[PDB]
Design a protein around this motif. Structure first.
Motif, PDB file in Angstrom:
ATOM      1  N   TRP A  99       0.825  -1.203   0.000  1.00  0.00           N
ATOM      2  CA  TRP A  99       0.000   0.000   0.000  1.00  0.00           C
ATOM      3  C   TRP A  99       0.863   1.258   0.000  1.00  0.00           C
ATOM      4  O   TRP A  99       1.971   1.265   0.536  1.00  0.00           O
ATOM      5  CB  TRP A  99      -0.928   0.010   1.216  1.00  0.00           C
ATOM      6  N   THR A 100       0.342   2.318  -0.607  1.00  0.00           N
ATOM      7  CA  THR A 100       1.051   3.589  -0.684  1.00  0.00           C
ATOM      8  C   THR A 100       0.629   4.518   0.448  1.00  0.00           C
ATOM      9  O   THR A 100       1.347   5.457   0.793  1.00  0.00           O
ATOM     10  CB  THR A 100       0.801   4.287  -2.033  1.00  0.00           C
ATOM     11  N   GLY A 103       3.118   5.072   3.118  1.00  0.00           N
ATOM     12  CA  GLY A 103       4.197   5.969   2.753  1.00  0.00           C
ATOM     13  C   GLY A 103       3.823   7.423   2.955  1.00  0.00           C
ATOM     14  O   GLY A 103       4.684   8.268   3.201  1.00  0.00           O
ATOM     15  N   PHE A 104       2.529   7.712   2.850  1.00  0.00           N
ATOM     16  CA  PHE A 104       2.027   9.071   3.021  1.00  0.00           C
ATOM     17  C   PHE A 104       2.088   9.496   4.486  1.00  0.00           C
ATOM     18  O   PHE A 104       2.377  10.651   4.798  1.00  0.00           O
ATOM     19  CB  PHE A 104       0.583   9.163   2.510  1.00  0.00           C
ATOM     20  N   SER A 107       6.082   9.815   5.585  1.00  0.00           N
ATOM     21  CA  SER A 107       6.707  11.031   5.072  1.00  0.00           C
ATOM     22  C   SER A 107       6.235  12.267   5.835  1.00  0.00           C
ATOM     23  O   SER A 107       7.046  13.045   6.341  1.00  0.00           O
ATOM     24  CB  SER A 107       6.399  11.193   3.583  1.00  0.00           C
ATOM     25  N   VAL A 111       8.182  15.394   8.539  1.00  0.00           N
ATOM     26  CA  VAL A 111       8.082  16.847   8.454  1.00  0.00           C
ATOM     27  C   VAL A 111       7.698  17.459   9.801  1.00  0.00           C
ATOM     28  O   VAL A 111       8.180  18.532  10.166  1.00  0.00           O
ATOM     29  CB  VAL A 111       7.051  17.274   7.392  1.00  0.00           C
ATOM     30  N   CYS A 134       4.848  27.486  11.952  1.00  0.00           N
ATOM     31  CA  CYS A 134       5.032  26.515  10.879  1.00  0.00           C
ATOM     32  C   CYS A 134       4.726  25.100  11.363  1.00  0.00           C
ATOM     33  O   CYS A 134       4.212  24.274  10.610  1.00  0.00           O
ATOM     34  CB  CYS A 134       6.461  26.581  10.338  1.00  0.00           C
ATOM     35  N   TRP A 144      -6.667  17.432   8.330  1.00  0.00           N
ATOM     36  CA  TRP A 144      -7.751  17.374   7.359  1.00  0.00           C
ATOM     37  C   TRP A 144      -7.569  16.197   6.407  1.00  0.00           C
ATOM     38  O   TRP A 144      -8.542  15.660   5.877  1.00  0.00           O
ATOM     39  CB  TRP A 144      -7.821  18.684   6.573  1.00  0.00           C
ATOM     40  N   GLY A 145      -6.316  15.801   6.195  1.00  0.00           N
ATOM     41  CA  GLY A 145      -6.028  14.690   5.306  1.00  0.00           C
ATOM     42  C   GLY A 145      -6.163  13.344   5.993  1.00  0.00           C
ATOM     43  O   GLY A 145      -6.721  12.406   5.424  1.00  0.00           O
ATOM     44  N   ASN A 148      -9.520  11.973   6.243  1.00  0.00           N
ATOM     45  CA  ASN A 148     -10.157  11.622   4.985  1.00  0.00           C
ATOM     46  C   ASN A 148     -10.429  10.117   4.884  1.00  0.00           C
ATOM     47  O   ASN A 148     -11.527   9.719   4.495  1.00  0.00           O
ATOM     48  CB  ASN A 148      -9.295  12.072   3.804  1.00  0.00           C
TER      49      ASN A 148
ATOM     50  N   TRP C  23      -4.431  18.603  -5.215  1.00  0.00           N
ATOM     51  CA  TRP C  23      -5.631  18.338  -4.430  1.00  0.00           C
ATOM     52  C   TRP C  23      -6.886  18.671  -5.230  1.00  0.00           C
ATOM     53  O   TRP C  23      -7.887  17.958  -5.158  1.00  0.00           O
ATOM     54  CB  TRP C  23      -5.600  19.152  -3.134  1.00  0.00           C
ATOM     55  N   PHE C  42       5.435  15.164  -1.878  1.00  0.00           N
ATOM     56  CA  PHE C  42       6.254  15.217  -0.668  1.00  0.00           C
ATOM     57  C   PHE C  42       7.542  16.010  -0.879  1.00  0.00           C
ATOM     58  O   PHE C  42       7.970  16.756   0.001  1.00  0.00           O
ATOM     59  CB  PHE C  42       6.597  13.801  -0.199  1.00  0.00           C
ATOM     60  N   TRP C  46       8.398  19.034   2.105  1.00  0.00           N
ATOM     61  CA  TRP C  46       9.554  19.026   2.996  1.00  0.00           C
ATOM     62  C   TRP C  46      10.535  20.139   2.638  1.00  0.00           C
ATOM     63  O   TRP C  46      10.867  20.979   3.475  1.00  0.00           O
ATOM     64  CB  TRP C  46      10.262  17.667   2.941  1.00  0.00           C
ATOM     65  N   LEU C  49       9.729  23.810   3.765  1.00  0.00           N
ATOM     66  CA  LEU C  49      10.062  24.225   5.123  1.00  0.00           C
ATOM     67  C   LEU C  49      11.553  24.517   5.256  1.00  0.00           C
ATOM     68  O   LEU C  49      11.959  25.433   5.974  1.00  0.00           O
ATOM     69  CB  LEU C  49       9.650  23.141   6.129  1.00  0.00           C
TER      70      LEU C  49
END
Lengths: 229, 229, 229
Positions: A99-100, A103-104, A107, A111, A134, A144-145, A148, C23, C42, C46, C49
């Motif tokens: 699954w991807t 990875g989301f 990553s 950050v 920041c 918000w993601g 989802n 998006w 991604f 990254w 920032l």
């Protein structure tokens, strides 16, 4: 002998015995396979060594006469991401295709921890005000993601798996948002006060999240179906 | 010109020619597939450039007039984990399902390396004695767990695959235990002496385990049945 | 107050909006699946920032009155590696078995980045000449190796895919060789000139490869066949 602590000391003490508790209880689990205890085994071990270190004040460098919380963020670069991976296994009782989505989450996590290690590395009182905004801002788009996956249309697919993920995501947000709150005050976050209460607050919080997450999954899944390998 | 060295220089020289030796011998291996020399190829490459630096006296910072073995553990943070992964390949010809034991191994290693990088970053003569016993202790629990895979009850499965991992772990332990031993004496290990013999011993040991491991697997597996992709 | 920037500021600005553009455009892509925009999402986030930081002069350290490009290579430690990963996705539209070639690139990459972070950490004017040649040297051996996959014998297998990777590696080499060139002059590369120019050049170059790589893949594949999961 001028500066001694016992808070971080007992921290690792309870962590070491924690993983060991799984070694004995391995004879039989409480419905949930060892997979959960596995990820929950590494979290305490690593963090443990980091805690005892805080006691002896080892792992910190005096930059410009100011002590930096190096050991604090470092553990937050390996532990936290692992705390994020444990969630993937919680919902995924099995794997068949790479699954991807994972990875989301990995990553985006890197950050966040980045804004945490730099916050304490503030060079000026003005720059600290910029990086701070920041950090929280990043959590916004990520909130918000991450909210989802729980699509309202997918609720027709399976309400069972939806409820489980809906329960673990609730407590999860409370923690991730907890730190950003306390940061509003104290050092490295607008607030010139003693570092005693600070190290005491950022100590009890992770703990309240560590053990709290363990018992959470226990009642979260609540299954009696076992499956050996 | 007052601190030149030629030991670390010849180190990278032998490692560079090593990988190339496989490029020519790639026409055909000694029965063992290319996946073996593959992982064993990256090990000398990375570590190679690292050692070469040690000769020019680079990658080191002078803090308070004290030299730190920064580059020393660095190579031990990327090479060692890879030296472990190679074992998984030698014990697993072909993969069909994602294992979980591979994760518990790579994780426990990160913990060991952590105690290694901090051991040299001792801020006090007392804190060093503490962080020291912590490193070895960590190897203790890992020693009992790493010796578990070879279950006496699973010997009824295959004595061939078992005897394979037996001879492998044998030499693997002598090395992993080797460093903890020499640490008993010398800098960062209770022993105020010249840094000449220190870097001379900690350099000869890795090399003795680098080349020794390659020839080890060759005689370890000993197979005449190759398989193409 | 005195030392203020604006180039790195607008940098993050264009990056943030970038990921956001996907998006809204997510409703439907230009033929290529979301996997392409995934990695391309991604990379800007990254790096963004990291850029805004360069503006406020954050992430660097004053060593002996000197300013090290700490944050400069940092992004080149996580971003660059991913830049390669994207290449493996553009070639492989679907995976069925774990490959080893993917590890060959990722590994050799860490080696290059190492020389990039140490190049600016030159403690002497002579050591800089030694570390420099070391970097370009490693880029040589990897050049012939990366130019191997496009074997002339495998041309009879598939001319379509072969042409895709041929046009992809073309632009890829121009940038990878680009940096090594500019390094021949300026700080950390033989050249005692104002840091205004250096920081201004190493800024536009990455941006030139960032957006250029995006549209590159769009025209590289150009497919109308879409697949859902």
């Amino acid at each position: 002998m001028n500066l001694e602590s016992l808070l971080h000391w007992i921290y690792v003490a309870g962590m070491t015995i924690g993983a060991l508790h799984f070694w004995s209880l391995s004879r039989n689990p409480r419905g949930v396979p060892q997979y959960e205890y596995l990820v929950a085994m590494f979290i305490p071990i690593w963090s443990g060594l980091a805690y005892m270190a805080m006691a002896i004040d080892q792992g910190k460098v005096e930059a410009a006469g100011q002590i930096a919380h190096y050991a604090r963020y470092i553990d937050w670069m390996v532990t936290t991401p692992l705390l994020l991976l444990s969630l993937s296994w919680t919902a995924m009782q099995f794997i068949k295709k790479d699954w991807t989505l994972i990875g989301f989450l990995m990553s985006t996590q890197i950050v966040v921890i980045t804004s945490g290690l730099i916050a304490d590395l503030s060079e000026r009182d003005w720059v600290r005000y910029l990086w701070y905004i920041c950090g929280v801002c990043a959590f916004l788009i990520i909130l918000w993601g991450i909210w989802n996956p729980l699509r309202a249309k997918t609720r027709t697919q399976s309400s069972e798996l939806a409820n489980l993920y809906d329960k673990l995501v609730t407590y999860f947000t409370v923690l991730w948002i907890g730190y950003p709150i306390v940061w509003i005050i104290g050092p490295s976050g607008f607030g010139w006060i003693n570092q005693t209460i600070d190290t005491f607050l950022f100590c009890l919080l992770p703990f309240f999240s560590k053990v709290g997450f363990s018992f959470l999954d226990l009642h979260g899944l609540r299954n009696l179906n076992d499956s050996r390998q």
